[PDB]
Amino acid sequence: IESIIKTATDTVKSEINAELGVVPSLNAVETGATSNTEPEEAIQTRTVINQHGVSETLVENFLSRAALVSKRSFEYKDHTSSTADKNFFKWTINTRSFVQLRRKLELFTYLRFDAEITILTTVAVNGYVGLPDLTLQAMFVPTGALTPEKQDSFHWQSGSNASVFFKISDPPARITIPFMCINSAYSVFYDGFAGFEKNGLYGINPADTIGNLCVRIVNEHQPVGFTVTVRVYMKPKHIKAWAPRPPRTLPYMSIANANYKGKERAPNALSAIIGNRDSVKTMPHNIVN
Amino acid sequence: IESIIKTATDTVKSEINAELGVVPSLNAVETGATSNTEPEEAIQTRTVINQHGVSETLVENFLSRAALVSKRSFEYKDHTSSTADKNFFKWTINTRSFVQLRRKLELFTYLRFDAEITILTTVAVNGYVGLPDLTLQAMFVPTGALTPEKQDSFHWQSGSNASVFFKISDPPARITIPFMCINSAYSVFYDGFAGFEKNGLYGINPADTIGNLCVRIVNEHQPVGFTVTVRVYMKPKHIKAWAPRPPRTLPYMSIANANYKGKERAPNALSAIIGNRDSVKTMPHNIVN
Amino acid sequence: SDRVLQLKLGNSAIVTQEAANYCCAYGEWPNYLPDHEAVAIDKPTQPETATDRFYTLKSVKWETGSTGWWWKLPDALNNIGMFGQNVQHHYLYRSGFLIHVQCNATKFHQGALLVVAIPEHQRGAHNTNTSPGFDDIMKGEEGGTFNHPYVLDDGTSLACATIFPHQWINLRTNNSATIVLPWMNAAPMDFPLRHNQWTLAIIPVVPLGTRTTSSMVPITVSIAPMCCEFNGLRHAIT
Amino acid sequence: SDRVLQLKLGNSAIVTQEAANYCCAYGEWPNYLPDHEAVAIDKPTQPETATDRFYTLKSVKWETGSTGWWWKLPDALNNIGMFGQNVQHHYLYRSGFLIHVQCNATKFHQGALLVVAIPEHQRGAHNTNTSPGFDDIMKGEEGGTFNHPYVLDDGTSLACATIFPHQWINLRTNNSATIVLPWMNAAPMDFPLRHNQWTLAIIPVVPLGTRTTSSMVPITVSIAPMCCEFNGLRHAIT
Amino acid sequence: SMMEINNTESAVGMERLKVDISALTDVDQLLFNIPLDIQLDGPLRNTLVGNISRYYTHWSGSLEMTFMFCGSFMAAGKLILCYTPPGGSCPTTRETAML
Amino acid sequence: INFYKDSYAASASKQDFSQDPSKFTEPVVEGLKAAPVL
Amino acid sequence: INFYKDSYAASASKQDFSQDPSKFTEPVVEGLKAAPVL
Amino acid sequence: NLIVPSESSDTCSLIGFIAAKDDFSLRLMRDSPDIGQLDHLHAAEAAYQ
């Protein structure tokens, strides 16, 4: 039954028992219920008034911290001879590329949230003359819109796409993206195929497609080359979460799938997740005096 | 009849019909009215309580996003020998030069709006020593006022013209221009001639003339040359719109007229707007398993 | 009193004399889609007892080397009876399921099956970058076998799978498991041929053992769809 | 006002602009079987819009030599859509029918079709003692052609067939006929594969004629089962 | 607004906005089909619903198709117009489309 | 937040949910019924 | 502090202390007593 | 079938139309793929002269 829980539960004092037909420490795991044995039933307890708050394990607090989702470096230079990100890049938006945020998100089956996006830009001189204060444009290109082909293409005029223009000397640029799934929740996992034929992608729900982030330098190139690095952070907020999942153990292989190999030996090998001890009778860090 | 609509309409359940003299799926297109057949009349429906909002298709939201209307590059240098924008330029204000905003505006015959103007400036060193933090002046020169002839002419003293002075290291400069037509609405299209003689321009309403934007660098030239690029964005706001129009299909040719040529082949050729399929019986992306 | 259970749905009934309660996943029960959650506006067909009945799949042999078995829903039932015909003729489907898993042995046998219903059990392949193909996933009535049950074939772990709806069959204690699944999807309905809401998994965490004379020990799976709805009447994809 | 009619059932609709009222056979309307008339005690499936919809049969050419056409119900529909699947999976069936017959031609054409629904149209053979065989009777969707429409292929007469539920298509006047049939049987339900309640017959009492350039003049039959019930869920006979 | 259903080579300009029907000598023949992708370049793109919707990424709700017959007063006929929900191939026979 | 003296300075007015599509869908002098149009 | 017009712009909602762990710990149709489970 | 007399044209035309109903809704505004430019329009430069 649903109730409001702000602090951990109190302990009541308990006495000796000795009752026939009452066995609170016996349980039946086959039902699928977890053990309902209370500490007051297992041992003699004292009264403890418990004041420990539970706010830090709220799903909102557990998930709503900003994490890196995209990092891209490119050359800001005269690109007339290059083969390359020619003063701009396109990113197909995903949340699976950096494992810290990915693993936390994958503790859940369904998530509904708004995304706070922070864009951090940094610049170095190519192998010094000072660092230029560049203007950048980030343009959100949804599904079925045309992406820019060039730094100076007319796609950047952004008649209806959301663009943010920001300087390197500014604080990091920030926008919120609304929860934009065509369903009521994102499918964090998807046991299905994207298309009506058999050749569509496994494991990606088409309902969750965000689109493209296109980022250019707006300045014309300088006589000298720079490396620009863009970092994108996402913070989920206003979060609802459903059906918690067993956590990822094996290293991720791919952003496209759940494929697994494991480490060559324990921990997190396919044959042994926990590191080995000599025997079930060995206490590995036993106190000896 | 006018009513307030915030969400899409609900669907009622419907039963079998079989009524003589009642034929809701039959229509008469020759009247000019669109079909009034409801889904409840065409098929058996269930009840659906519809919660989908309609705010994103408000004319205010559809039009009030900032779009590029002017882009100009010029040399910031000693111009004593040049032929050129000699540290300043004049722009005859128009909204027809960039096709994304133009095509959206041309979905309507008459528009009344205030214009939010954002000015973005960027600088590169000519073919490096760092980038200078220049001061620029933008001056609105209405109809019949004198425009500057030189970077240092006394027109720039701006006794009664609106000027904004802004730095490159600032955020983009922003002002709102009021709705300033001599009529109650701008004429987006104008089936007429500008003058009382026959030689005036076709297709421009004199009532909609805004004036000139004159932009100079206020600094004296440096010993080295820079390219300055100015970008002007307009955002319509407080918008009223009348008489929706069929959209532009063929590429624009000119800012001065609606002249048309089309692409050499479909799509958007003069003979064929939609790309061809083999026959009226061919399903181009047919699902096959 | 919680060891004997009769399940009756349509023209089918199951009795068991050694249950261990039963699981209602997340405390939910199946229900039809209410009007305040509806999307598709055509009137649904609700076939009731024609579809809301137990279908019994082919039994699998529990053997000493067994890694476990899995079946995907609705895929395992998409070709069975009047449920399958409605699946083939309609674009959209919605239902719950009643799952009953059956395994009996002697009082001299030992062994424990984890019986777990996994929502959106998106599989991984082992030791490759290539995603699982259509024929790796879509097994139909036969179902599949676990490659690496210890990581649930998805880089995760068996040990933590008890976060999902489950019972155990412990041959010492019980010969059957029952799980009731609600509709479990982000959308209110789905196309039944390209997405599976639920995977049933049966994994022998304790292997089958005895020193009596050996017999074949089958595991049998019976599944009743519950509150089936279908929308978008069409020809059969079939 | 009685010349324009729209019929809507499930996901299907028919409009006509030249009807001539419509017939409700014996003044009845289709209804479900009430409890005071029920025999079989299992809960019926009532698929509603999945079955209670128009099915359009193959069109037949009206030609100068045509003797007329017939289709038996439920037999003509027993293999079509979700109606056919329920027929194949259930021992027992009950429904009404909505019959719409379609034939248009120019204002320079002439011709009259008697469109008649015959209950228990037990056929005779011509000039033999041997009763009609299974393949003479069971035609399915294609239907049959009349051997001797003047005696209705049963030693009787066409002239008196207007005692049965009927309309006419008179090309001068109307391009469609509609007949609504109730359940018409001595038993409250029947096995759909061995007995036909109704035969639709279309007989050209006045032949097709014109002196304009000839075109193919098809006759099209659309039939909606109404209030379909099925009992005795089984595997498919199929 | 008018669909460009006859988006075929050898239909030029206004010829692309009409479909021509003739008397047939075989029963129940297919006359034409209409692709329903608004995103891809089909008959629906250059329409009022089409052009406005392509400023957006998501859409929901019902569409109406109306057909006006522009033969002579003396022309007669019956057509069947069928919508097939997705999941299989486009139907090529009337007995399939009728479902 | 608007501390400017001219009301045209303000932010956009996204609150007008009034519609009348019948001026474009049904500009017929006699309204359609649910019913032969002609 | 939220002067934006869209409510999705707001700061995070850290106030929902409602829990129901029994949907995960006790999804049994008949609840456990304090008492032989089986 | 289409059935016509000798003095009517043997071939007849359909015009097809589409509209949204009032249950229709649109979301997530984007730049339309139906328009673009690779060059300055004619007389665009002359706005600066």
Ligand SMILES: CC(C)Oc1ccc(C(=O)Nc2cccc3c(-c4cnn(CC(F)(F)F)c4)ccnc23)cc1
């Ligand atoms: C240019 C400016 C104006 O607009 C911008 C728009 C967007 C961004 C940007 O980078 N956004 C994002 C980056 C990474 C992930 C997301 C997701 C997301 C992915 N997956 N999920 C479900 C989950 F978690 F369950 F997997 C949710 C949703 C929306 N945005 C995302 C940056 C800028």
Ligand SMILES: CC(C)Oc1ccc(C(=O)Nc2cccc3c(-c4cnn(CC(F)(F)F)c4)ccnc23)cc1
């Ligand atoms: C220097 C500072 C102090 O003052 C400034 C004043 C103005 C600007 C500037 O660039 N303004 C503008 C640029 C582009 C178009 C317009 C329009 C307009 C054109 N056409 N229409 C009707 C339509 F849409 F229907 F066609 C409306 C109206 C007012 N301004 C405009 C920049 C700065």
